[PDB]
């Protein structure tokens, strides 16, 4: 979440979707929303290569409990991350996602 500008728009577009239960959620729909955010925010001016790996994954309730980004990496660069950094980032990304919706709720009440 070090971008901030991109995650702001991404939390405004997933609001109408994640409120529904997880059973009606299918991954093929959210990708069009993620792709829309990367185009509108400042993340468009970015290396096309790294943007090819950034996608969504569905953890396996409510839509605010199974959504998370993945950024899969394979090849030579995969010897630095080694399937454990990707099992640690997602362990972190939840705590930064919760502490981000608990704030945009409290600026909506305000």
């Amino acid at each position: 979440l070090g971008q901030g500008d991109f995650i702001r728009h991404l939390m405004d577009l997933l609001k109408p979707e994640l409120v529904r239960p997880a059973t009606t959620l299918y991954q093929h729909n959210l990708t069009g929303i993620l792709e829309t955010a990367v185009r509108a925010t400042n993340a468009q001016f970015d290396s096309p290569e790294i943007l090819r790996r950034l996608d969504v994954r569905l953890l396996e309730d409510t839509g605010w409990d199974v959504f998370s980004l993945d950024y899969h990496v394979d090849g030579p660069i995969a010897t630095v991350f080694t399937r454990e950094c990707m099992s640690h980032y997602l362990r972190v990304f939840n705590f930064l996602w919760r502490a981000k919706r608990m704030e945009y709720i409290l600026t909506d009440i305000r």
Binding site: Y26, Q27, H28, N29
Partner: protein, 35 residues
């Protein structure tokens, strides 16, 4: 003639509500309803 035009309406409108039904259940194929 005056009595068969209304039959086609009940017949054709029934198939269209079937097309719009199946074209909704999908994960493009969803933007067709807006067309």
């Amino acid at each position: 003639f005056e009595a068969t035009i209304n039959k086609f309406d009940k017949n054709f409108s029934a198939h269209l509500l079937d097309l719009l039904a199946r074209l909704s259940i999908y994960s493009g194929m969803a933007s067709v309803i807006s067309r």
